[PDB]
Amino acid sequence: FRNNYDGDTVTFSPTGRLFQVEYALEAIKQGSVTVGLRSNTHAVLVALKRNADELSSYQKKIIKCDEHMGLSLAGLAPDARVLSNYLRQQCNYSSLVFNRKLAVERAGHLLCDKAQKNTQSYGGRPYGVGLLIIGYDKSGAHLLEFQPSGNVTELYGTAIGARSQGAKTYLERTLDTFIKIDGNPDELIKAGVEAISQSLRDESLTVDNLSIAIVGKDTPFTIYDGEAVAKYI
Amino acid sequence: GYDRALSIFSPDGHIFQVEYALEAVKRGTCAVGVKGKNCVVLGCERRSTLKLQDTRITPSKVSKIDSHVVLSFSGLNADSRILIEKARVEAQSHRLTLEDPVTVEYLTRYVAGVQQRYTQSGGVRPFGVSTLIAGFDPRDDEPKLYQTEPSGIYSSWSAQTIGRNSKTVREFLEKNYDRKEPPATVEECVKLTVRSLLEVVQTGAKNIEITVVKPDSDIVALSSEEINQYVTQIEQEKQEQ
Amino acid sequence: GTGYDLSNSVFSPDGRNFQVEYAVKAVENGTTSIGIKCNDGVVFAVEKLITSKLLVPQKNVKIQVVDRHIGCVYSGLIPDGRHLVNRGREEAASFKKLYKTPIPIPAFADRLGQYVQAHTLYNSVRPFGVSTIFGGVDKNGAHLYMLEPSGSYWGYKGAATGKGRQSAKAELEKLVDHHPEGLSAREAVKQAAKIIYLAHEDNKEKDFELEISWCSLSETNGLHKFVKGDLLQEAIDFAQKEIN
Amino acid sequence: DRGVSTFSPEGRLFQVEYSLEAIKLGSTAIGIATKEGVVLGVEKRATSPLLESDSIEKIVEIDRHIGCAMSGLTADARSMIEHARTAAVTHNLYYDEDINVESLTQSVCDLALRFGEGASGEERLMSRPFGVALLIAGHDADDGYQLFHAEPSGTFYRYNAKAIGSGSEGAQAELLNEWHSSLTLKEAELLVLKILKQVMEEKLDENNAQLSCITKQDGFKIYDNEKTAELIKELKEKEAAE
Amino acid sequence: GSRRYDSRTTIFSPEGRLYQVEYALESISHAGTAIGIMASDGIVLAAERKVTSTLLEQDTSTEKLYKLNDKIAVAVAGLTADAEILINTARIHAQNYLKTYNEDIPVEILVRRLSDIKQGYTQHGGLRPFGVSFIYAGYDDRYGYQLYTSNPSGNYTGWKAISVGANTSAAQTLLQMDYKDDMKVDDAIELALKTLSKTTDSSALTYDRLEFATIRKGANDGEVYQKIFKPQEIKDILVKTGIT
Amino acid sequence: MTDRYSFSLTTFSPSGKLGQIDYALTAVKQGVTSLGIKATNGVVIATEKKSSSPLAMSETLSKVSLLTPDIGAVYSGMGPDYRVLVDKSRKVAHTSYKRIYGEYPPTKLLVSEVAKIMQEATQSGGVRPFGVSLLIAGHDEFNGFSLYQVDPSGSYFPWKATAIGKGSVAAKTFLEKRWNDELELEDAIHIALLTLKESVEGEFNGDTIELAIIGDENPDLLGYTGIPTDKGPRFRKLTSQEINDRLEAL
Amino acid sequence: AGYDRHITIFSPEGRLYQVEYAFKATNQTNINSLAVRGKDCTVVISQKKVPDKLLDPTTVSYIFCISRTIGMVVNGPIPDARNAALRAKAEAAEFRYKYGYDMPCDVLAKRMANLSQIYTQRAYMRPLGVILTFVSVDEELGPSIYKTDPAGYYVGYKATATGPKQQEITTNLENHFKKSKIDHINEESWEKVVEFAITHMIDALGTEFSKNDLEVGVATKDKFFTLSAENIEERLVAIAEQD
Amino acid sequence: QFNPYGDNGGTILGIAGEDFAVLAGDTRNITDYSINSRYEPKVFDCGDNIVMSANGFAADGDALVKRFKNSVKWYHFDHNDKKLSINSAARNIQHLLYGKRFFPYYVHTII
Amino acid sequence: MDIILGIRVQDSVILASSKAVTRGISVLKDSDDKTRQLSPHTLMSFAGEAGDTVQFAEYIQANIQLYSIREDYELSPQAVSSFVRQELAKSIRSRRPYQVNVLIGGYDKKKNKPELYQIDYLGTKVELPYGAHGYSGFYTFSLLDHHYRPDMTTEEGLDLLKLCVQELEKRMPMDFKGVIVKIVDKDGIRQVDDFQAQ
């Protein structure tokens, strides 16, 4: 079965599945957990950085696209770089040609279309990385989840990566609560950390191991690492 | 149009087409090179699957890249022509822009790079060739000897050999070449060279050509006799015991 | 022998093209969506499974507009659907640019047809993983169409595809018989909301979110618009009521 | 056959993984980062006594503030170094300054996944991934002394210490214990020489092993045999000392 | 995709051999035998026509001996059609050389070029090699009379006497037995006929199954002359040489 | 999209065979028999119009085609392959010869061109060899009358007489018996008709048979007068009637 | 080896399975059609089957208007039939532009045959699983019928039929011409030729037709058109008042 | 014929103090003998504490300032938010200008 | 323009080429060797446009050297000149043609005779007993037509040139700072270091 239909993305299985895409999705699960949640004033990205050795660094998982947009990654870093760089251009083309900030919803559409092209043609491979995009635009705070299959969904909160289901449950529970953490970023960030810890097990989030990003009403997307996040551990 | 990845990785971390390229070199006729204190010698053996040729016009094994550098090889003859032409051209180009002929390391690094490129480019197979490049840098007298292989790797040797039974002749050279006292003479260097070949040539007066390269574009190829005289003086070193 | 199903443009001994047939499986495995042609327009509707409470309601829109008078909804691999609309949008711009008049629905349908059919000619590409329902109002009436992964398409009175295509196709056949005089835009909107609630049983496990859009010469002026607020709620009710 | 950029059922790229296997077979290379600089050492590993060991170049200079060591199919690294140097020089031509070590690394990794037989995203014309890993080390005013490990996967990690090649797993564990935030350049030098000795099949001398470092003051320097030889002696001594 | 049907004509066998070249050679080995013998006053080219009939027009026929230049000619063993492609490019390289230097092209230069073309089909392109082996017979003012050979691999070498095609081992032994450095063109002609005569797979050795050519420098002139023998001429030389 | 089949579909087998060319010859073997006979003052090519239905109009399907006013072709094998070959042949006769020397190419050269096209479909990437064998007959001032045969490999050879397709073996044999170097054109046509009879199962008349000749110039088939050096085409297809008149003296 | 059945290269027997299988595809729609020639018109009859009740019967057709003068009916899957149609229309339009006169039926047929011959020889192109019947009243040849297949083959007919029960239609028509001794329906009005056509379509198939079971196309001097359900009914009635 | 250039007048001035620097310019913008605007800013804050002005043909001046600002944005993106030093900006701008060596930005730029 | 003269005597060819290199108002150099050795027995002098002059010469040089290495043989003077003509002829119909005129003097070791070839930037070649490019011919062609003989010795040749160079220094407006002379014969190419006062 599967073995005869997972050679490349251009092939459909007898049941209508695209295994190469499914396999790509698998790279995400094997990726370090990251969380995303928003109120009506802010959107937060809390990402657990993973280290190779104890002599290594905890690889960056948060990238800024524009002053009002950024995302967290789970999966193949190179693919996140490619996709983030593409987003940086679309966000940039919008400002230059139209003097308009790109709507978060529209950036999701672009990512979906770029990802899709890599699932219908021979020779290419799907992207192997999941992305959580947060932003503040002309319609408020926004959180998006990107899947290599090309599926992009807008949520109040979510998480991707290993054990990500912990955090996701916590959020689907804490919903009514954090959605109202307006005008108070530190409270949203804390909620973000309490969510990402629901997917811990190995260790405990440390200073050089924690990474957080915030954006909103009067807050240009900015990233905090180490010391700057000590007051959240 | 044709860009199939022919050279790729297999589970154990190998690139079989490069590995098989080497098997083609093992099959080529043995080649050797030893550097004296003021010269370098290149020796090649002559096959005999068919004999009734015309030695005048049949392509020789040692090729001049420029007046001060020569290149010998082991493996696919046709493949070696391609590398030689590219090196001869790169030699002129270097002279035309740097206003100075290539060093032997530069010319080697070039051939090597060309070989590496064919190991990770679509639509092409690696060169079934390994080379020994030798000569003297411009205005320098210190001898130079390098070797390249299908993978694109290269390095310099005091003495080296490639081709069939190169396994055997290398051993000879390892317990017959002293870095402390390299063949201080063109003559004793040419002898040490023929000796190592006789280990595998099996009586081959017409099956052993030797080329001697000295500083300042001084390159010359010995005649059957000149070499034949070396073999004779060597067969006596043995019998006289 | 076998293997006839591993390459896309290959004919099996029985004259079929298995990869296309497999793509269809992907279409049947998707959400259900429909199209109801009416006396002066067409109505589109689709099922939106609420995976979780985390999904922002009313946000992840699925129905798509092409030019200003055409509506498109599809079931199957969503990304493939967007890819097809993008093509259709270019296809439309091109036509208007040269001929000035916005593109006729029949002409637009062939554009998508030829393009989709194209992806069943080479083994270097994959067939589309969606069935698309689209249509609009033009110089001579309203038109409803459904395009299959094979590039096949026809004009319909009503159409459905996806998980509950049978429930829908059933409900649609009824309407066709009990309304030879033709449904109305206003009526088709409620009717649609119902066909969707019924066809949801073939997925009754997960909660959903309804989406409707319509293009009526009288209700929208021949332009495609989404049903929102009151008119939407009125339809959800009409459905939630007759579901009991 | 099967795509050169295909995913395994576990969500990994076959060619990249097989590439990593080729790297395991390479000569060991070790990097130690201290507040006094970064040390880079490698195992020459000549295949014959006739091979002139000093023509083994497995530690090269990118720019005055950046140097790097390789392990695996070393031939595959030539173009990577070339690209690296050009990036460094080019950055300087455009901005009249030194390129940040991380930026230089990110540039090198950008070539990494540019392989395939026609991957829809640009024009990645490289039949296979590189079969060599790199240890990039340097210094820059913003983040000081840095050590990076660049793989054929396109990803790169930052380390305080890192070992790649044949004895990497064992050597890494070694580095795990020995390393601390207050090491001195000399302590690092010795430490690198020590671990190389444990994993090297040959008896470490100044001919089958090479050291180097990069310091803000004098940039990247490759230690000449004589200098290292003494460091080896100094090591043998301090070890026999207990 | 396509990869599935790619023979990969240019790869190495585990033993470091080139499959296609090897099989092309195997193909050549079944071709009519061609022989080239170099004397002191000229060169002889002889070839046996494979497959003939009572109705085959031999007068207007040519399948093994072709004129490349006015000083160079070749004997063919293998696919005639493949050979013609190479011959035409060959004739062009010659004219180009002539137009560039205003001197006829040295024999080896032309041979190295064609051999290089062949070698190419061996290392890249994904195409099959040319199923052809050439025996080049030419003259130039730097090496006088020369005799060369090239095969699918792109390798070439020089000879005093040689053969290509069928029963080469048998023919080579016979040549290596009666050949002598001081031979004369007329001696060479006879040797050539004898060899073929003993390696034929046919009954007798008639003229209608032969092609003959000589490149001599007719004393009463001072220039080089190529002569492709006419049926009648081959019939004559056949009688004299005592084969009637 | 984009033809990604840039590799050869015809390759060498361990035995040294080229499968696709072999198979192509096999396809040719199944074809309807066709033949050609060279006389002293002409050449004749003929085949059987194997109507694939009585509702079909056999005239609308000519197996014998004119390439130049002094050259014609006929075949055995896959008709569609033949058709596109004839188009290319007629065009190459112009692009590569008439447009350069202002005169139609001589038979051997045109045949040579055709052979080339077929050889390419034997080695180019992404294609299969042509499934036909052609018999081309023509005349030219310096070479006179000639007859050739071109195979799927691209090989070609001159013949005094020959046959290809279904019953070639038997036909070739019958020709060897009747051929001589003193045959006049009518004699050859006659022998052609006799030979083709042994190959035709059903009806044998000017409506089931297609025959053409390369003989004298036909000033009547020129279409105009005034240019002395233009005397008309040597190629002439016989009429259903012209054939029957001869079948009576069979 | 066994791939000589996936792409268009020869099988050891010198066959092209993909072309053979494409022929199989032509019957997938289970529809039959036939064309006959009048005195100065050409008619094509084809079964029209509309299974789904949810379909708009007016958009289910396999007959096409290639040009003001050329008409084309297809036997095979609709997506491939439309691909062939679009192309034929483009080809016909261009021919007029470049040569100054209307592309003749037989010429467009040849052109399409050649295009099909190519998918037969090139590996990346699959053949189209359809059979195309072209009809018109050529200004030089008169009533004309030319049909092409996935093999790139094409020829002209006095009359012809295509589909699952093609053989019965053919032999039926054959018998009529063996009798009449002429190669066409000797009728002055196309209405009677359309009637002759439908009549025999019934004999050979042993089936009665309603106005919505058939699809009819007529070609006359300078124009090709298709009849309406009502135009067809008027036809069905006429035949009724004879049996 | 079409002339791709124009002159919008105006003047700019830059003076460097010991621990500060100033860049001034008038706000008038003209065409021939007409005033297009009495207040159309010509000196800009481009970030990283750098002020710029490309006086001359306003269309070219705007294109340059816009291209340089976008350059600052990407510098941050590609070099971990590093601050672009005034000297580095200057070198960057040289490349922007010389890029159009054969169809110049008709402006005199100061930073 | 610069002076470029060539004379073919009994057993050799002599090339005399001015040493001045003037740019606008100043004479930048007075020791310019306007020549390149294509092969041990073939020499080429050149004059023309500023950059094109040396770029072209060196380009031709690199090519003849590559031919020598590949074939281990030295092309005849006739072969080299034909190669050079063709290059210029291509150049004349290109975007920016090389504006260079050349004299090619070689000793054909196979014919054992000296040969002089004159070729202008358009690709116009001709073999002559003696030649010049630019305005040089205007003063010298008459002296040569007069005192030239096919059997002159290399010594008589140098005297004839000296006469030519003197006429040039007398009647020409520009100070070409004397010439550099070179001889090509069976033994190769050498430079007459003593012509500043021979």
Short mmCIF file of C-alpha atoms in Angstrom, two decimals, chain E residues 96-103 105-106 108-109 112 141-143 156, chain I residues 64 67 70-73 75-76 78-80 82-84 86 110 125:
data_model
loop_
_atom_site.label_atom_id
_atom_site.label_comp_id
_atom_site.label_asym_id
_atom_site.label_seq_id
_atom_site.Cartn_x
_atom_site.Cartn_y
_atom_site.Cartn_z
CA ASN E 96 35.71 24.96 -40.47
CA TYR E 97 39.36 24.16 -39.83
CA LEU E 98 40.11 24.85 -43.49
CA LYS E 99 38.34 28.20 -43.39
CA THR E 100 40.09 29.24 -40.17
CA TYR E 101 43.68 28.28 -40.97
CA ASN E 102 43.57 27.86 -44.74
CA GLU E 103 45.17 24.44 -44.34
CA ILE E 105 42.85 19.61 -41.05
CA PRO E 106 45.52 17.32 -39.54
CA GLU E 108 44.32 13.35 -35.60
CA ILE E 109 42.68 16.69 -34.86
CA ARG E 112 40.03 13.57 -31.65
CA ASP E 141 52.01 16.68 -44.13
CA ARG E 142 52.95 16.13 -40.51
CA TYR E 143 52.59 12.38 -40.04
CA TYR E 156 40.80 6.25 -30.23
CA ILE I 64 48.18 30.51 -30.45
CA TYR I 67 47.11 25.67 -29.88
CA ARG I 70 47.37 21.07 -27.36
CA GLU I 71 49.02 20.00 -30.61
CA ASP I 72 52.66 20.17 -29.53
CA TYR I 73 53.29 21.87 -32.85
CA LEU I 75 51.28 26.66 -36.72
CA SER I 76 52.68 28.03 -39.95
CA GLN I 78 50.16 31.51 -43.01
CA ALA I 79 47.91 29.56 -40.64
CA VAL I 80 48.32 32.12 -37.86
CA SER I 82 44.48 33.41 -41.50
CA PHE I 83 43.35 32.81 -37.94
CA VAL I 84 43.97 36.46 -37.09
CA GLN I 86 39.05 35.70 -39.35
CA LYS I 110 58.77 23.96 -43.12
CA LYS I 125 44.90 40.53 -45.39
#
